[PDB]
Amino acid sequence: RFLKVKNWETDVVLTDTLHLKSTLETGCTEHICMGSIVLPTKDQLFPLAKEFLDQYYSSIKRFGSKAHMDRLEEVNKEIESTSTYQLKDTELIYGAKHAWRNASRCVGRIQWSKLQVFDARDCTTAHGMFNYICNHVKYATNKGNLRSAITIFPQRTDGKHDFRVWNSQLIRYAGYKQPDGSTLGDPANVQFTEICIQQGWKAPRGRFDVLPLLLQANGNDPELFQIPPELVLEVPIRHPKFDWFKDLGLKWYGLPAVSNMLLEIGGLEFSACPFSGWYMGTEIGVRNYCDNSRYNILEEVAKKMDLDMRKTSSLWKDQALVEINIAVLYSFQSDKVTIVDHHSATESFIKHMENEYRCRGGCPADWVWIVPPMSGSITPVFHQEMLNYRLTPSFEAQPDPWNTHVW
Amino acid sequence: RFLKVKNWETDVVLTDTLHLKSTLETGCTEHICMGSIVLPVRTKDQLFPLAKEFLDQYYSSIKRFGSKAHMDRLEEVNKEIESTSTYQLKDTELIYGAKHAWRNASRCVGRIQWSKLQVFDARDCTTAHGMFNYICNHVKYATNKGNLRSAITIFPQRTDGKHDFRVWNSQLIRYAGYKQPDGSTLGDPANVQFTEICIQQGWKAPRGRFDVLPLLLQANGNDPELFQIPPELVLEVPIRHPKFDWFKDLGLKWYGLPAVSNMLLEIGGLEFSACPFSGWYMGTEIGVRNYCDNSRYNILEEVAKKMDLDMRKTSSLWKDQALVEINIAVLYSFQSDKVTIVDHHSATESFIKHMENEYRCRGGCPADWVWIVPPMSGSITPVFHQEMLNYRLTPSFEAQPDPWNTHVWKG
Numbered sequence: 001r002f003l004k005v006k007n008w009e010t011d012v013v014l015t016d017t018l019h020l021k022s023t024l025e026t027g028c029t030e031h032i033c034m035g036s037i038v039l040p041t042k043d044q045l046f047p048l049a050k051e052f053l054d055q056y057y058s059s060i061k062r063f064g065s066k067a068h069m070d071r072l073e074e075v076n077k078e079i080e081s082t083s084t085y086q087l088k089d090t091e092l093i094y095g096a097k098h099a100w101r102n103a104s105r106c107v108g109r110i111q112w113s114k115l116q117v118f119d120a121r122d123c124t125t126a127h128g129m130f131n132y133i134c135n136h137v138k139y140a141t142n143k144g145n146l147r148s149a150i151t152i153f154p155q156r157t158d159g160k161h162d163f164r165v166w167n168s169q170l171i172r173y174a175g176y177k178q179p180d181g182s183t184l185g186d187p188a189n190v191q192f193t194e195i196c197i198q199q200g201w202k203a204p205r206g207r208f209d210v211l212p213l214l215l216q217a218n219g220n221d222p223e224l225f226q227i228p229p230e231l232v233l234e235v236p237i238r239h240p241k242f243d244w245f246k247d248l249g250l251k252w253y254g255l256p257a258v259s260n261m262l263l264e265i266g267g268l269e270f271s272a273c274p275f276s277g278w279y280m281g282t283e284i285g286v287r288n289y290c291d292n293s294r295y296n297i298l299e300e301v302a303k304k305m306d307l308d309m310r311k312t313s314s315l316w317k318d319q320a321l322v323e324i325n326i327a328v329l330y331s332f333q334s335d336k337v338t339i340v341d342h343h344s345a346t347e348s349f350i351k352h353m354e355n356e357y358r359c360r361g362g363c364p365a366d367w368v369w370i371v372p373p374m375s376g377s378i379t380p381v382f383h384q385e386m387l388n389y390r391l392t393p394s395f396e397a398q399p400d401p402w403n404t405h406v407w
Numbered sequence: 408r409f410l411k412v413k414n415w416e417t418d419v420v421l422t423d424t425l426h427l428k429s430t431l432e433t434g435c436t437e438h439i440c441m442g443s444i445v446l447p448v449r450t451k452d453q454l455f456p457l458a459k460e461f462l463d464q465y466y467s468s469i470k471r472f473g474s475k476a477h478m479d480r481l482e483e484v485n486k487e488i489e490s491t492s493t494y495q496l497k498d499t500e501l502i503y504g505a506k507h508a509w510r511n512a513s514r515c516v517g518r519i520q521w522s523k524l525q526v527f528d529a530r531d532c533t534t535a536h537g538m539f540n541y542i543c544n545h546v547k548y549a550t551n552k553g554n555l556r557s558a559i560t561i562f563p564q565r566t567d568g569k570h571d572f573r574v575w576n577s578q579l580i581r582y583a584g585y586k587q588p589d590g591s592t593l594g595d596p597a598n599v600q601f602t603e604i605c606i607q608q609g610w611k612a613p614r615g616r617f618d619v620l621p622l623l624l625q626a627n628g629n630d631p632e633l634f635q636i637p638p639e640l641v642l643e644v645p646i647r648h649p650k651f652d653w654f655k656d657l658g659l660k661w662y663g664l665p666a667v668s669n670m671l672l673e674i675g676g677l678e679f680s681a682c683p684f685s686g687w688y689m690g691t692e693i694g695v696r697n698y699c700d701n702s703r704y705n706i707l708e709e710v711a712k713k714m715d716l717d718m719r720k721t722s723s724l725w726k727d728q729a730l731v732e733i734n735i736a737v738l739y740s741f742q743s744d745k746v747t748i749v750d751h752h753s754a755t756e757s758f759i760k761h762m763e764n765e766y767r768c769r770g771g772c773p774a775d776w777v778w779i780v781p782p783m784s785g786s787i788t789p790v791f792h793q794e795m796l797n798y799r800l801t802p803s804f805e806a807q808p809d810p811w812n813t814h815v816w817k818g
């Protein structure tokens with residue numbers, strides 16, 4: 001019931017108590033662990049509300065107070081006659097910061113309390129959403145000096161009136177199948193690119209074409225908008241030693257803004273809640289550039305370095321991997337766009353973990369995701385035992401809207 | 408029940424039925440995943456089922472399920488457990504047992520090789536001197552002048568648990584660690600404790616950076632005894648780099664035989680507490696962990712120094728650069744001296760083919776992601792994108808507490 005996490009590098013042992021306050025289920029059983037699997041009504045709602053409001057009132061040290069009890073009553077009466085309820089702004093701000101605080105896959109949580117929250121619950125149309133999203137992008141980009149933020153559209157009602165952003169990120173590059181057999185652009189985005197073109201998009205058909213927004217309001221058919229080009233900050237990728245690097249014509253965008261997840265606060269579900277922070281180098285350099293299913297540039301780079309690609313054992317893949325990541329980091333710093341490297345990102349998470357154990361009694365963490373996709377054991381997180389569990393408020397994955405929505 | 412695992416790189420989807428035969432417990436609950444926790448006497452009562460399970464598997468695997476020979480063996484084991492409270496495995500069953508413990512080891516990336524294991528039956532051993540001879544013969548057979556052969560030596564099983572055979576070393580070959588009065592370490596910091604015990608037991612420590620530790624061997628619950636592996640049986644590889652000639656000047660070497668000696672082998676409910684085993688290294692174990700852990704030889708600084716990388720900001724990736732070169736150096740030295748070794752690209756690609764083949768012939772492959780993924784360059788290796796299901800099958804290799812923590816000193 002009390003659980004120890006040990007760090008095998010520092011021999012430091014922490015004690016987790018926070019997991020007993022966990023509520024959702026993990027995928028794992030006593031027989032079978034699924035740690036590595038990417039995807040493992042009116043009554044129902046009130047305890048969810050009570051659970052949240054209790055923790056909120058506890059956070060502002062007013063637990064049991066009259067103001068506490070009165071909200072609990074108000075919310076209770078709102079649910080009975082309306083079937084749902086509305087969060088107070090203070091409650092919304094708290095809920096969002098905490099969904100982030102609870103995101104066990106996020107290495108970046110030391111930042112969790114500096115979250116700018118934009119209340120877009122007054123939004124009614126897809127046009128509304130487009131305005132709110134541009135202002136989010138502009139505010140978050142902040143001329144390169146990135147600031148973390150979330151925009152929160154109206155909550156689910158009866159499920160046939162959902163707000164949704166169809167893109168998986170606010171900013172992404174198209175993917176087109178070609179007569180060749182090859183893929184041009186980002187292969188991760190083929191299906192979505194095809195949904196856009198069929199929904200009317202004039203696709204330019206290049207390699208780094210910024211995709212349009214596909215925005216759905218009040219459960220209506222999704223509509224299309226182009227982000228103002230002058231709002232999408234992008235970075236050309238060069239290497240500090242390799243002059244030839246620029247000639248791959250590689251670029252990435254500054255703002256990572258996850259747009260496809262679902263925010264749950266006190267039983268209420270926000271289905272469109274784009275949020276953003278900033279990149280950890282390896283996200284672009286290792287995954288976006290090197291995944292076989294992504295831009296897949298290892299072969300090309302190694303060939304420019306004139307490494308012996310005749311055998312795996314020369315570590316030519318590993319050599320080229322490091323330099324691709326040097327270039328990402330160097331390009332972002334040279335243009336003064338915020339980026340953090342994986343040594344510094346994990347160092348920061350270790351410190352935040354220690355803080356969470358000291359001040360909250362634990363920190364849910366998904367080691368599989370927290371450990372960077374390169375150089376795992378030279379980052380401290382690798383040696384850090386972690387306990388994974390699901391707390392609420394939370395961000396969840398949710399079915400791509402096209403599989404479910406009807407026209 | 409059908410469980411599906413996906414590969415996010417290829418979209419190949421597999422289906423596990425084998426997990427339906429898992430007995431042991433994970434440490435994971437419906438509420439908590441302990442997937443990254445390192446560490447998450449038997450009655451007649453509880454033994455015959457385990458004997459039975461194992462024998463059923465064994466006889467099913469040889470296409471003899473339900474034969475007279477199967478029934479007679481069950482009856483025979485049952486009676487032996489009856490009068491003597493334990494039972495003795497046939498050679499065939501021990502061999503099959505040991506291969507399966509390997510095949511079942513979910514943290515092992517080298518399992519494409521599970522069927523090729525040399526088994527040394529050392530159940531006739533009675534003394535520490537006896538153990539030492541078995542271990543030398545194992546080191547020599549397995550090393551095979553650099554053309555490495557995988558092998559296991561199995562000493563007698565636990566009886567009442569007061570007469571345990573144990574190899575106090577965690578690996579048969581390992582370098583001593585020496586904590587200094589200034590608080591620094593000489594040699595391998597992971598072996599300071601065990602080094603001291605060896606010194607206490609009477610070993611003359613040479614006190615150098617790469618001293619091969621002596622074997623500390625306990626037979627039949629007796630106090631353990633010191634022995635020196637003959638140096639001529641200890642194959643070592645000096646580490647050098649294909650382009651950087653200053654790399655040799657770092658003075659690094661490493662031994663060729665990885666040989667884990669601290670684990671427990673469970674077969675048919677029987678417990679084999681000294682069962683040292685070996686194969687060959689994957690390069691990253693030496694170059695990433697052994698050399699580059701802060702709590703190990705910790706050579707990143709000194710290497711990157713000699714490369715003149717920019718060490719002012721971590722964001723130049725100086726550590727990543729040096730790491731790759733250290734690992735290029737390890738693979739190069741072993742290859743040049745003709746000592747078997749496998750890089751992590753080749754190993755993980757091998758493990759993936761192994762795993763798919765298992766899902767076809769066996770209906771599954773318990774696999775622990777946290778361990779299967781190498782400690783450098785994770786996502787450019789195919790296992791990173793592989794979903795895996797971790798669960799426990801017997802026979803198995805289990806961690807056991809270190810003997811200096813449990814042993815009753817006899818004086």
Ligand code: HEM
Pocket residue numbers: 100103105106107108109111115148149150258275276277278279280283340345369395
């Ligand atoms: C400010 C700096 C931030 C950093 C360095 C950071 C870093 C990361 C990284 C490396 C991942 C792994 C996901 C992947 O590799 O695809 C991740 C996932 C995630 N992050 Fe953070 N993030 C930041 C800001 C935020 C913010 C503002 C939120 C929420 C408001 C957030 C919530 C999440 C969630 C919910 C996941 C899991 C998402 C998924 O399953 O795809 N992060 N983050």
Ligand code: HEM
Pocket residue numbers: 505509512514515516517518520524557558559670684685686687688689692749754778804806
């Ligand atoms: C043939 C060459 C082999 C290779 C390349 C290989 C590779 C590996 C690697 C890289 C690990 C994890 C490394 C670590 O972090 O300690 C491992 C773990 C393991 N291997 Fe293998 N292995 C091989 C042979 C064997 C053999 C012969 C056995 C037993 C018959 C075996 C059983 C195990 C077990 C039980 C573990 C988990 C160890 C622990 O819990 O500390 N392996 N193997």
Ligand SMILES: Cc1cc(N)nc(C[C@@H]2CNC[C@@H]2NCCNCCc2cccc(F)c2)c1
Pocket residue numbers: 038039256257258275276277278279280283287397
């Ligand atoms: C199927 C599925 C489930 C899931 N939970 N997720 C996915 C997106 C994949 C996962 N992993 C790569 C890719 N997602 C792209 C990277 N996501 C950005 C995380 C991040 C980073 C910095 C700041 C932020 F605000 C947010 C797919």
Ligand SMILES: Cc1cc(N)nc(C[C@@H]2CNC[C@@H]2NCCNCCc2cccc(F)c2)c1
Pocket residue numbers: 445446517665666667684685686687688689806
């Ligand atoms: C605490 C604890 C638990 C556990 N299960 N285990 C340990 C030994 C650790 C694991 N990781 C580093 C260190 N021991 C490293 C030795 N492991 C080599 C595996 C191997 C490779 C090639 C061929 C083989 F036959 C065997 C410690």
Ligand SMILES: C[C@H](O)[C@H](O)[C@H]1CNc2nc(N)[nH]c(=O)c2N1
Pocket residue numbers: 035036037038368369370415791792793794795
């Ligand atoms: C199969 C495995 O779960 C999958 O590849 C995971 C591993 N760890 C990851 N970690 C992060 N941060 N992002 C990912 O997309 C993945 N992919």
Ligand SMILES: C[C@H](O)[C@H](O)[C@H]1CNc2nc(N)[nH]c(=O)c2N1
Pocket residue numbers: 008382383384385386442443444445777778779
């Ligand atoms: C804390 C964490 O589980 C621990 O460092 C694990 C992670 N993965 C590993 N993987 C391998 N091969 N060997 C290890 O010792 C470890 N250590």
Ligand SMILES: [Zn+2]
Pocket residue numbers: 028032033034035435439440441442
């Ligand atoms: Zn688990």
